[PDB]
Design a protein around this ligand. Structure first.
Ligand SMILES: Cc1cc2nc3c(=O)[nH]c(=O)nc-3n(C[C@H](O)[C@H](O)[C@H](O)COP(=O)(O)O)c2cc1C
Ligand SMILES: Cc1cc2nc3c(=O)[nH]c(=O)nc-3n(C[C@H](O)[C@H](O)[C@H](O)COP(=O)(O)O)c2cc1C
Ligand SMILES: Cc1cc2nc3c(=O)[nH]c(=O)nc-3n(C[C@H](O)[C@H](O)[C@H](O)COP(=O)(O)O)c2cc1C
Ligand SMILES: [Ca+2]
Ligand SMILES: [Ca+2]
Ligand SMILES: [Ca+2]
Lengths: 638, 639, 638
């Protein structure tokens, strides 16, 4: 079994109205990952190009390996896509966030075969998402592969799944692992070899059945538990299909062995031990390249998330890339995954919710980092309830090892009956950013918990917009770095001290692309990130969370970009996971503070040009301010 | 004077019928820098799209600052371009490598003005280059700006120049600096305020004239000499055009104060002291983006070149970006600049040679890193050709009394050819040891020319060898291995760096680069003679041969880290280092110490099982790994 | 509005080093019209100088009448040109055959302004023509003018057009004429006075509007139709731009009122009546002077074409002079005009086809002689099809009053897709000259008309080379005058008898410059003319056409240059449009013939020196022959 990368140099246009009969010669050349909205969907006006575009590329049999079957594998085509080979329709897909495949073998008539793929991201009442606060970046934004396999092979045609499914039960200090596989055109002549390898490639269990016995239970004694960031231990199930003595096809996945519970009062439980889920959400895009992410971009996103110290990520609002989920497995992050069933219930979208959800569970069942499947987000912003029951029952029938969840819009009456459908729920609240006061958040959650004490309640969104604006009068709607620091300061104090809230997710870890937005001085993005869209600047609110969640010791001065201050006595905030901070102004000491909540609020003289140095143990940070007569108007959006 | 960036979100297409009258809605969005050959001109076949493509963008007056005139400035449009404003042609330019500008004030008759730029890189007998070993990447591959200035302003119309020309003369410990300025629509009552600033922005000289006097001489006592890598000291010159009491327009440029000679026997001399020119060449492109380079890409290229330690760069084969030349001035690099008069003399290309060279000199006269202007490269690959060189050479001497002319001569050209006698200095492009012959021929070939022409300063403007991820224990010309390219450059270093009369040496090339007609070595569309790969991510072993000879950063580098599986029971392991002595350790036990005066430490090492290799010199270390196999890993072999 | 002649005494060089700062003193003096290819492009070897050349001339403000604007107008600069005023580039143009203009007022800052025009006719992949059987004569080969106008004036900046567009419609005995006008810098308080005048200069229509209303529909009572040679009646539209009581600028154009059809069975129709189009093509060059043609040369060419009696001219292969098209209007000739989209489709050439077609239509819209626009000639000798669909739509968009056509190479398959694009098509067939046999032509045409009964079909080229060689045994490839006359006798009998062939065009009316030609014993020329290159000799084939097409009575003795003949009894052809011819040999009747097809084939005793007299009524011609023992090898090319 060989996987041939098929990314290089496709022909591309928006300007075509029929599949071309022969390879286009005047189209634009792209190499995948590619989106045609990387610019016009990150800059405002809600005007990014939505419609049908064409990708063409020749497949040459001469350049292919010898095998009995050839699959086209698409890891992401947003949103709807039509595959052609030599002018003939061979596959159609709705769902921009999941893998799908088509055997093209019988169509490779020639030595030079024309693959046309049409991708459409327009408006319809049929394919989710249709209404949401993010760009539906069009195109082949994830890899396209060719898969050459033997006539008999592990299944490639069931909802883009790996062809292999792994389920551990923890029995004491051992574990039994069910490794089920799926085959296409097998012969009872053939055998199957199930192997589990440990972290060292060292074979720890093996067994051999017939090709008609497509399931096996292996034992793993003294099992190393997948225990989050403490020890994200991954095994590897591998299964070979052997014709006589020759392994003729194989497949594999990593997997972790753990148990978990989501307790209405104790919060999240991991392998029998409380393991609070405090974390962030992440969109799969980046400034300048739309959603056409490279492996390095995924690596960098999880690195920064790891530096902050999150224990959970909510991967909203759709299926993310398999590599990103793998990273979550290796690092021991606890993941919420969901489908883009969002904002506004479309009665004709029922089919597309079921097929994206099926794809989400089948393709992601083996990732030990995933614990909840999300049915919908803000969907109320009876047909709706049926759509939810159907999804809730299908997930519970596909996956006995995980629970279901929803994210609820802020205004939804808590007695809405759809809240009673999933196993757990979370609310998306913006008290103190979009209306209200930040102090309202704790009392709201408490009130829900009193009313529904046996429903585990999380916070799946909360956030506050921030760009390079500054003030000594931080308020809701000024968009300043300083007001956003305070908002997260207050949210951390309220939420991180409520054990019953089973998971919190900052909205959002990064600024992200949303072409309909036109606010804050920079249009086409949501600026509720802790980090900017290009991942180059970490806002002060990043270091408030780090102070609570990282054990790596640090000290961070807030306000570095706020230099020209008017007041004679200015406020200087310092974050540190160390217990005591001392701040110096021009070598003169403005006092010592011990903040057990890690937020050190100093009052400091503002005269002339001053350098500030905060000192906590062996660690230090440094910033500078300047006294001025008038507010530096560059600091102000208004 | 305000500079508005104008790069964001153009509509682009290759297959447009006519100049569009409304903002297109189905074209492809690009943000400049952009080249449409970023993929098809880096991958082989000599088939990159060459033709006319359109860029379209709206200019809204509501966004422009209030100003008397607005100029469209193009830093790079390859190769020929036409500019339309609300459908009317206002400008045409031939020359893909220089700045040109056009006043579009009169055509901004609407609140939204359609700005359309047609760009062409097709085949023709008139615009250089046409015949050369690199891709002619089409597009607006450098910045496009809008320049808003007062009705009286420093000249924006003379061959894309800055409007200011600085000429220092060194007199003992002091400097005399002539500053000349060029005006458009200036009034006899305006003044010119000339200032020279220190490296810290401190004013050190100041003078004034009436606008009718567009020259001034300012004194710099106790001048800080621009002295190469030792002290790349730069001043700034500022001239403001003043109406009554107010500056209505201002231009500035940095500059450095230095003298040099190119002595036929002692080589390059800088400020009276011998200053050997030992370096590389660099193309202005990069894997994946064609020649659509960002400032960080220019900074990375020069960082890598500085790390190697080159004292000179040959910026072949055309005018590079202003930011790269500034970087050279700041870092103390000595530069050869040239025009794309290349391979084959086109009789109808003469006007364009004149044009590009005028733009080359006018736009770059202020850069202290530049010491020679190159007229042509390998042009003989005949009387009309000779006259083209006389004219270029006399025009350059006419325009710039402070630099020398040079050429780059193709390997086979007879040394008695008449055109070698035309410029002030010459260099040859030789590949003995790569295109046939043997690496030992170079040194003596240079010695023989030197014997024949003892008064012609002679350099090596190209030499090099191809290398990809292929490996061998029997390196040979044409296996394309990393090891043979390493041997080749060791031997060139030994021959070239010990002959002081070779006034400048330039490895062809610092980086792998785009050449769509190349189809060899296992990866097509690239010349792989680089010391560093096309994406800048991998420094080949030959890079460290040069670092060991030219850098003062202490290091120790293990060669052959990618040649892991070896058949031989005892294997050669080369270390490069600028330290005096290296010790090699094999799975923790010493295989001995060596002291290589030419910095090339050749160890012989037992190859059994899997082995970890550690080389140690002082407090610096490097690590590699090999392992023993019974048959050659056919993945190391190009065949 | 004053037009100043600016042809006088330009400095010129072929060495294009740089634009000279001062007026030169050792270049060569030329008065335009001028081509530097006048000798080296008419003599063989395909070696005429192609490259960049400079023209330099001083413009002195004192010699200019006072006016607000000064435009340089160039009627023809072949092929690509740049204009400089005092070293400053002010215009660029690609297209050797059309008018282009540039406002240069702002650059007339000295009292002696140096005008430099760089003209280039080299090889590239972008500017047509590049591949064709004719010399691309470089230079300022048509007038250059200075046009001095008032600040407000009719448009001089739009594709070189006249500024006035005149569309006659007809219904019944009257005509209605729409006059549209286009203004630069007009002011609201200005007026437009429109007038239509008689052939005798008497006003027939008048009306006033405001400068903002730039269209007017004037009516001509009892209009005299433009009816071809029978009555080439021309009106004149004039429109004046008035400030107060003062005309500050005026433009005008002659025009003709006429309808026409191209019926696929009935052929060409003009004002309801069948009007058969039988004629010739004409290249814009002349022996000795290249294409640097004077008005007297245009007049003599058209006189010779009228004497022959053609009803149509195909003005191949490019836009001709305005003065030639005016003659065509004045004499009632029906014109085919075309752009040099020729021989071989260039992918980089699209833009230049568009620009030349725009200029062609904009500048020639008013010419009543012109009925068809030609898109291309032998262009096949998919990007091609798109290129033709763009041209076809653009012309149909710009000109609702004329049809589109093409000229198809001989071997092009009749089912080819591009033949379906234009309104009408024609072929270039040379059966009987470039292989084949002259009898094939008519039947070939019959096949097409059978295969495509409603695509009007014409013959855009057909011809046969002829120089001063002679024979009593005419065979294709002897280049004799006698074979060419036989060829044309047979082509007339086949073509002129098929009503459904909407237009026939002899290739060519005159021998013309083609520097790559090296045949027939005089290189540098295509010798397929009916008339020689210096317009001095009418070949016998000229008279075969005249006998069918002219109403002036005449008798023409063929073979006058074939004096020495070996045979005792020799063939003597007489052409005449009179019914009957008697031929006398030394005063003795050698026979009386009537010939319906006007081709009088006599046989005659050849004894001694003989004088021949051909007699029809009161009309005679005379010639001489001589009996010789052996063939005069001076009559023989080989
Ligand atoms: C995580 C997971 C992965 C699965 N993968 C496959 C597969 O790759 N091939 C297959 O044939 N069935 C696979 N199945 C089995 C189907 O879910 C099961 O057969 C289903 O009940 C019948 O599907 P159907 O209604 O489409 O016929 C998988 C099931 C789960 C839960
Ligand atoms: C480095 C340099 C820069 C110059 N810049 C300008 C300029 O910006 N504006 C101007 O009007 N003349 C400028 N000149 C003056 C021109 O050289 C002058 O017009 C000359 O006479 C024209 O010859 P050329 O075509 O060879 O440049 C400059 C000259 C030099 C050497
Ligand atoms: C025969 C003809 C002559 C024309 N002359 C002019 C003209 O002189 N000035 C002008 O502005 N437009 C002229 N137009 C065209 C219309 O005014 C045109 O729609 C508009 O001005 C520009 O359209 P474009 O994008 O095709 O250039 C002419 C059109 C035709 C068909
Ligand atoms: Ca947008
Ligand atoms: Ca290519
Ligand atoms: Ca000739």
């Amino acid at each position: 079994r060989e996987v041939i990368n098929f990314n290089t140099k496709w022909a591309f246009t928006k300007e075509a109205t029929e599949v071309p009969k022969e390879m286009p010669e005047k189209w634009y050349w792209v190499t995948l990952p590619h989106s045609w909205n990387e610019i016009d969907g990150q800059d405002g006006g809600n005007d990014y190009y939505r419609g049908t575009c064409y990708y063409a590329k020749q497949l040459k049999k001469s350049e292919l390996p010898e095998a009995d079957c050839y699959y086209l594998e698409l890891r992401g085509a947003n949103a709807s896509a039509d595959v052609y080979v030599n002018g003939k329709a061979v596959a159609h897909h709705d769902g921009g966030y999941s893998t799908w495949r088509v055997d093209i073998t019988k169509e490779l008539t020639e030595e030079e075969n024309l693959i046309v793929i049409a991708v459409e991201n327009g408006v319809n009442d049929r394919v989710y998402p249709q209404n949401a606060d993010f760009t539906f970046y069009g195109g082949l934004y994830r890899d396209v592969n060719i898969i050459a396999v033997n006539k008999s092979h592990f299944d490639l045609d069931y909802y883009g799944g790996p062809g292999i499914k792994v389920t551990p039960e923890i029995k004491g200090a051992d574990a039994s692992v069910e490794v089920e596989v799926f085959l296409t055109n097998a012969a009872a002549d053939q055998k199957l070899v199930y192997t589990v390898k440990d972290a060292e490639g060292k074979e720890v269990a093996k067994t051999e059945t017939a090709a008609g016995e497509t399931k096996a239970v292996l034992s793993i004694p003294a099992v190393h538990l997948w225990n989050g960031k403490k020890d994200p231990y991954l095994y590897t199930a591998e299964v070979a299909l052997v014709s006589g003595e020759e392994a003729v096809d194989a497949v594999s996945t990593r997997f972790g062995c753990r148990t978990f519970e989501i307790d209405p009062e104790r919060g999240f439980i991991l392998n029998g031990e409380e393991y609070p889920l405090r974390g962030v959400s992440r969109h799969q895009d980046r400034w300048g390249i739309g959603n056409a992410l490279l492996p390095e971009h995924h690596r960098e996103d999880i690195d920064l998330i790891c530096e902050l110290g999150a224990t959970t990520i909510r991967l909203a609002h759709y299926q993310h890339d398999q590599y990103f989920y793998d990273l979550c497995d290796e690092r021991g992050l606890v993941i919420w995954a969901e489908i883009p069933y969002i904002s506004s219930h479309m009665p004709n979208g029922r089919e597309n919710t079921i097929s994206q959800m099926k794809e989400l569970v089948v393709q992601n069942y083996n990732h030990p980092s995933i614990v909840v499947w999300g049915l919908s987000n803000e969907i109320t912003m009876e047909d709706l309830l049926e759509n939810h029951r159907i999804l809730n029952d299908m997930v519970h029938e596909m996956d006995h090892t995980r629970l279901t969840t929803i994210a609820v819009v802020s205004m939804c009456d808590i007695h809405d009956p759809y809240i009673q459908i999933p196993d757990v729920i979370s609310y998306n609240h913006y008290f103190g950013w979009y209306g209200g006061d930040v102090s309202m958040n704790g009392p709201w959650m408490d009130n829900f918990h009193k009313e529904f004490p046996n429903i585990p309640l999380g916070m799946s969104e909360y956030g506050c917009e921030a760009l390079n604006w500054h003030t000594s009068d931080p308020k809701q709607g000024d968009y300043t770095e300083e007001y956003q620091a305070y908002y997260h300061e207050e949210m951390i104090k309220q939420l991180f001290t409520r054990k019953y809230i089973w998971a919190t997710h900052v909205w959002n870890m990064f600024d992200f692309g949303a072409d309909a937005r036109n606010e804050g001085g920079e249009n086409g993005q949501n600026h509720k990130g802790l980090v900017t869209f290009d991942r180059k600047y970490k806002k002060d609110s990043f270091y408030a969370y780090k102070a609570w969640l990282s054990d790596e010791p640090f000290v961070h001065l807030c306000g570095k970009r706020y230099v020209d201050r008017v007041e004679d006595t200015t406020k200087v905030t310092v974050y540190s996971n160390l217990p005591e901070v001392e701040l110096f102004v021009n070598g003169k000491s403005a006092g010592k503070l011990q903040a057990e909540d890690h937020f050190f609020h100093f009052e400091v003289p503002n005269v002339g040009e001053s350098t500030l140095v905060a000192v906590a143990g062996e660690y230090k940070d440094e910033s500078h301010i300047r006294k001025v007569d008038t507010f530096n108007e560059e600091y102000s959006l208004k």
